[PDB]
Ligand binder design. Structure first.
Ligand SMILES: Cc1cc2nc3c(=O)[nH]c(=O)nc-3n(C[C@H](O)[C@H](O)[C@H](O)COP(=O)(O)OP(=O)(O)OC[C@H]3O[C@@H](n4cnc5c(N)ncnc54)[C@H](O)[C@@H]3O)c2cc1C
Ligand SMILES: Cc1cc2nc3c(=O)[nH]c(=O)nc-3n(C[C@H](O)[C@H](O)[C@H](O)COP(=O)(O)OP(=O)(O)OC[C@H]3O[C@@H](n4cnc5c(N)ncnc54)[C@H](O)[C@@H]3O)c2cc1C
Ligand SMILES: Cc1cc2nc3c(=O)[nH]c(=O)nc-3n(C[C@H](O)[C@H](O)[C@H](O)COP(=O)(O)OP(=O)(O)OC[C@H]3O[C@@H](n4cnc5c(N)ncnc54)[C@H](O)[C@@H]3O)c2cc1C
Ligand SMILES: Cc1cc2nc3c(=O)[nH]c(=O)nc-3n(C[C@H](O)[C@H](O)[C@H](O)COP(=O)(O)OP(=O)(O)OC[C@H]3O[C@@H](n4cnc5c(N)ncnc54)[C@H](O)[C@@H]3O)c2cc1C
Ligand SMILES: NCCC[C@H](N)C(=O)O
Lengths: 455, 455, 455, 455
């Protein structure tokens, strides 16, 4: 039962902004809900809901700028887009492998962590089966309220305006229910200035080979940060730029291992979202901060040991640490950046991150400083008045539905948020952890009435 | 679409002798074939085939005598009874876990090798859904040819006689097609005599606690062998009998690690059976012998290191090896067994296995010496004449169907063998390796005509 | 060159209080310094310094109450008592093994972490070679200042009074230089009352089998804490008390893995003590708190996974968590302890550790709540006035020598502290990490003038 | 006590042919024996033995042609050149590290297997301390018998003739005792012809970059073999030649893992040589063949998995195996080699190794086919008559001393063999396994009388 197209001029049941892992999980869960074989009920639905997905990328891609060669998953394959909701689903990773004639070969690796490339292709293979309801090259620029009865004081739909990435004109689609699943934006430090030589990690594979077109040149590249991205870049820079001198700049004293130990990893359990959301604001803030080592500013141990083993080989050859080709500079901060000099190389000034150190001259600076999740704020400007009086923060309910004033907004209308709700739903929110079950829940939250007609 | 019962007096399409892993895989594959949602065709079948399973155990059990505490799988969970044929199947291990509310918890172990206890329960959970077509407590004692036209010279069915394990009387069931999937029998050395104190590994958990009813007594137990069973027993004996002196007797000089390395583990691939069967008799004999380290006379490395680490702790405490509580005696053979003495302890005499050594006095002797797969020979005595002239060895075709004289046996009739066909189908034959796909193939081999009516 | 005895009535060069790992390291370093083959200089010393060690234990023991069966080292064998100072030293772990005829056997384990039992024996084997200068069964009860010229205002020696653990009388020994290396004291929570059923982890192997003399009884034991001790106890309780119900009580939500990753593990490097001591008080407090995961409130990953795997087996058997034989209770605190009831079992009342829960009834309560290092404070009461005016905290210099008023105390006299100086010397201070080099430094700090005569 | 030079015209006590790991171990053991601090006796020796080492390499090198980047040890660091004989020795790996200021850094890797580069440097650091008794650039071309009394029928010394690798003239040195420790020679298949494009693995790093001077060219390289060398080359070829197509040709069906499991690894124990030598010729031949998996035709598991994981990534990208950039061709033999064609590429013809397949066109062919140890045979031609009548095979005694006719050869004279004696001393013979203890034994075997004068 493939999801059939809805003409743009028609009132949709659902419009999802973005078609990343989060949205794909919702589409996969809708497919399954409407599948009469996974749901006995689904036989008596017949009428397919009017759903549309808008993605600003040309096709499906999963962090293309960070697809570093050899890079692995930070999560078991069992936490794919379907399995935890229903292992029977056609969209499980194992069934993807089987459909590729590769399942037996994978088994022989004996790994729960597939290559980031392979997993992208898995999520690519899922994405293609919804190409009839996904409009690519469409960047959403704002969501606007609407009224079936213009004279009334009740909002019952939303107009969603999207700029065409190629042609540039704005098209508009009307829906009763809206989902924003747009992921993170590159978070840059404020002290750093704008320069084509200062590049965020998210754009590593895509915009750096353009700048340093010669993989043979003896460049000077620097990497800011101490999380998974910084490590992956720093480690790759050795391989991709064999004659270049690399420098790792971090305010912390060392890269710290990500926590995946079985007892800690319980916070990521799909069922724990209920128990997390139940907790008081002070207890959520206490939990995220305590469990930070599972997600943020941390590196997979095997890569920490790998980076270290390389560093040790440099010692075997040269006892003088200052003479190494690849160097780590712990407890440092960037204070001054000279990027107006005639040469190719900027001049980075460094100080101790503890309460003047060296100076570096670099052709490029990879800034692996993480992501912000406040992008939806810009999209929901025109809909802010629909919240209760006083609300400057969007408040998402358990089912991820933003709180709105019930006297201003019809119950058939509403906006959902997906990816940013870490403060309320837990650390598993921004990741792949619960997407399968979250997708299942979302389909029920949004199409509950419709699916109950057959149930 | 549950498999409905067939009255014993009716002509069956299929009778499987035994309801172990192999038969369960065939039932699981039939279920799936007849499932209209996994097979589009299955909708237009309607009429269920007349199938029956006969098991001599009271209920489903998977090597109960060897369910040693802590004992693990020798195979990935992906090689379960359904996944490699279809990951969508309801009978996959992951879906079993989901149906138990446990899938998320398993993930957190980060293991491809579940506990032998858990996997039994998985295969128990599969087995229960076919209780309507399985007759337990029924030991098959012979399969006999039959003729629809008694005066003709053509055999077109088989009468299968089974002794009731409890009541004792012989019942008979008629089928066109027969499957023998009865697994291995305990292989004992010829030099050893009959004694209730000499026990085969297969009966370790079941018949040893009866003999040594006191888990506190300072017993003397011995273990013969150097394979996975001997190691598991020997290692358990330390834990189950804390005050007893254990002795490991092996003709080889050391326990050798099982080979599960990715390139070697290709022989177990479901697709390789085709390529194996294609090979000449000399090349099959060359392959099994070369790849032996994957299956026979080998121990999982983690358990070799564990047994060794225990042995090292004995050295830390006592430098005198002869004074250890748990001892390994390499390159030894049992020559004389004195089991007629007044005392509780037999007297085992040992010689060098290389071209007189010690003497041991033991309350029990666990003989972990592997299994034979010639049990079907006894069952198929009365059907031997149905083979082509001269044939003293049963010759199984690729689809596991025994070769019979086509002028004596109707094409609607035939006998299949499952588990013993290692000489022709490979090392994966006796194990769980290919059961999912083998079950799929078997259902097609047996019910090909019937399923094509809807196809 | 064995260390010869000094009669108690004679003025010593050195008296060390305690003969644990720290003191043994100092004796080992003195041996080596005086060894003419490890030190070319040592040939022209001839006159051995007058040194004495006072230990309150009957013989050498390394945490006997926590020698849990199977328990391993938290540190590489290379960080033994000699190797990092000089791998040539006779007192290295590898040379200990060689002297036991066991070095080749150890190699075959392929482990950097020996059993806690074996390592004790290693440090026992080192300790015996200094039995001529160690007085066992001697608990030091106070160190007192003395004056060669009683009428003068200059202190130039110390009288060290020790109670005899057996006979009870106080003996006194005079030395110019004093070392306090007494380790930690059991840290108990204030909310808990005194009861023979409430036992600190340090006394687990020694005082619990006395209380619960029946290893067969269905007891109820509880374990407070979430660090390495709590885990080791909790895990052992399963094995040592097979029929007892165990309960783990922790204010944190989960046991967290100890950090031994190569980059973090740099703080433990012998050379880093210099760089640590150099840092400001705010930066030391920032470092210890940030690196806490390496030492405090953490469990070795393999044991976290082991405890978890056991817990998972309980789920396989019983889905009802409340019915498990061994249970973990996260985010709980003990509020009320009823220990005056007629029965064998106390009644523990539990609340949520976050801003009433269950009630437990237990025969014993193992309190694994860590250690305090303020024991020397009691010993140095009579010497407090020797510090500069105002000083209520003992201030240890880099060489671990407590700051004293130079106008009140002769330069030939001084007190050293060993083990408690984490606040000033780093996280490696209380552990085995730097003992080899620290011992080398201490011998130079104390016998510098004497050893320079030959140098 | 450094080993002082002996003028070439003087009668030596010992001449060792070759200065590889084996000889260095003997020099290290002599140093230690003569060290008055490791041997109490050594003080009363005074007179240093007249020893000389002749090496054909310009300086110390340990398999320079196979120093593949990233390549590791196949053996624990504890099995270095000194530790197992005496961990106190100055020449241990740990003490080498300490002398480099690197011991603490190594610890943090947590590895028993150092990089092949680092270990070479360790053995380089040992080698330099014997530069006064090693004559480099000297290839021994024959050992010749001599008689103090030319008219007598008793041989009591040996003249050892060596060609100068640079200048070319033959120099001669006279010794009473001779050691041949020259290692293996490249073993080539007979079917392959002479071509600068056909290169043995031993010359990989040294003679291949000369042939394929462009690391950018899209070459075709092939690798024959399935042992550790073939794997290391094949895996490196991907990294060193990023645009080249690699092909692995092996007569076996898969690369098999080296056995390092604790129980099997007992055959390598220094003490086991005694027990091995004691065994009958049939039992030695049975042991080597059974334990082959520890040394020959085997690959370290981590590299098998690594090669496999790369191969799997090729499947993810292209399902067509024939289109992969790096390919493995199992069960193949080279039958015809066309190396007279005008092009750069030879034409290799392949057949099935089981009782015509593809054709390959290659710029180079790396032949990793192992080593022969019959090089000493050529050197000892002129001394063959000194054996007992009939002897065409050199028979080495337990102490590695070749059997000679006692009526023809004085007891003060004799020849020792080191490295080739696997047939008599075990699998540990050709490796680093027992060198420390073997060196100790050799020094005692050769300088027994001399060292007993002081003992
Ligand atoms: C390099 C990298 C690797 C990671 N790997 C893992 C891992 O191993 N496992 C794991 O659990 N977590 C991982 N994550 C975390 C990751 O954020 C989530 O796993 C997952 O990608 C979240 O998906 P999402 O749909 O919420 O956000 P995204 O993946 O960012 O998807 C959002 C999509 O919406 C589109 N979009 C954005 N703005 C607009 C707009 N205005 N209009 C229309 N479309 C828009 C974007 O193009 C994007 O395709 C990784 C993150 C990074 C950066
Ligand atoms: C202790 C142990 C653990 C193992 N674990 C693994 C593992 O980790 N993974 C793996 O791949 N391989 C394993 N195996 C190998 C094992 O043989 C197969 O995996 C699998 O059990 C084969 O199933 P089967 O149905 O062919 O034989 P069986 O499992 O023996 O099933 C045959 C059934 O038929 C019944 N039966 C026998 N005779 C008769 C009769 N005359 N009439 C009626 N019924 C009869 C028996 O009661 C039995 O239930 C293990 C073997 C042992 C002994
Ligand atoms: C169970 C356990 C295991 C550990 N294992 C490790 C490990 O794996 N590696 C590691 O690096 N760290 C470990 N540690 C940390 C440990 O504290 C140090 O490694 C080491 O024991 C410190 O030695 P110390 O001499 O400073 O203190 P201690 O080991 O406590 O030695 C002090 C000695 O002085 C004696 N003493 C005390 N008071 C007096 C007195 N008044 N008069 C006379 N004598 C006295 C005591 O009896 C004791 O023998 C462990 C700690 C515990 C509790
Ligand atoms: C690539 C590679 C890696 C290895 N790594 C390991 C390992 O991880 N651990 C391990 O235990 N085993 C390893 N080995 C096995 C190795 O053979 C031994 O460990 C060790 O090198 C044996 O030393 P040797 O002195 O007996 O022989 P060699 O190392 O070959 O030393 C012989 C020396 O004598 C010189 N020589 C030769 N002929 C003459 C002549 N006619 N005149 C004068 N001088 C001559 C040679 O130049 C050479 O330097 C490895 C082998 C190879 C090929
Ligand atoms: N071309 C291969 C033949 C080489 C032969 N098997 C040998 O080892 O001599």
């Amino acid at each position: 039962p493939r999801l059939r197209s809805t003409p743009q001029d028609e009132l949709h049941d659902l419009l999802c902004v973005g078609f990343g892992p989060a949205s794909l999980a919702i589409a996969i869960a809708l497919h399954d809900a409407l599948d009469p074989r996974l749901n006995k009920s689904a036989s008596n639905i017949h009428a397919q809901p009017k759903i549309c997905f808008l993605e600003r990328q040309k096709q499906f891609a999963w962090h293309s700028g960070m697809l570093v060669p050899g890079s692995k998953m930070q999560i078991s394959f069992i936490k794919d887009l379907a399995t935890l909701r229903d292992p029977r689903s056609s969209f499980t990773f194992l069934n993807y492998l089987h459909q590729k004639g590769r399942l037996i070969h994978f088994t022989n690796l004996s790994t729960f962590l597939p290559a980031r490339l392979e997993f992208e292709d898995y999520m690519r293979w899922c994405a293609q089966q919804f190409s009839d309801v996904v409009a690519y090259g469409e960047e959403v620029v704002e969501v606007i309220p609407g009224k079936s009865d213009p004279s009334s004081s009740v909002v019952d739909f939303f107009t969603v305006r999207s700029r065409n990435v190629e042609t540039g004109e704005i098209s508009a689609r009307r829906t009763r229910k809206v989902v924003i699943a747009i992921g993170g934006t590159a978070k840059m430090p404020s002290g750093l200035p704008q320069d084509p030589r200062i590049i965020h990690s998210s754009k590593y594979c895509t915009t750096l080979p353009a700048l340093l077109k010669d993989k043979s040149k003896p460049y000077n590249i620097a990497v800011l940060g101490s999380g998974q991205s910084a490590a992956e870049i720093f480690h790759d820079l050795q391989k991709r730029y064999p004659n270049s001198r690399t420098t790792l700049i971090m305010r912390d004293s060392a890269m710290r291992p990500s926590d995946d130990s079985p007892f800690v990893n319980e916070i990521f359990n799909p069922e724990r979202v209920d128990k997390f959301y139940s907790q008081s604001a002070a207890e959520r803030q206490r939990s995220l901060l305590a469990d930070k080592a599972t997600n943020y500013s941390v590196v997979r141990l095997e890569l920490i040991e790998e980076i270290y083993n390389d560093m040790y080989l440099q010692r075997v050859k040269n006892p003088d640490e200052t003479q190494w080709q690849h160097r780590i500079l712990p407890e440092r901060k960037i204070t001054r950046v000279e990027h107006h000099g005639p040469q190719s190389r900027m001049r980075i000034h460094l100080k101790s991150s503890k309460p003047v150190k060296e100076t570096l001259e670099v052709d490029a600076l990879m800034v692996a400083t993480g992501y912000n999740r406040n992008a939806h704020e810009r999209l929901l400007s025109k809909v802010q008045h629909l919240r209760p009086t006083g609300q400057d923060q969007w408040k998402p309910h358990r089912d991820y539905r933003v709180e709105m004033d019930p006297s201003k907004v019809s119950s058939e209308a509403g906006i959902w948020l997906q990816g940013c709700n870490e403060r309320t739903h837990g650390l598993s929110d921004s990741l792949l952890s619960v997407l399968a079950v979250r997708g299942g829940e979302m389909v029920q939250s949004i199409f509950g009435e419709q699916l109950e007609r057959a149930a």
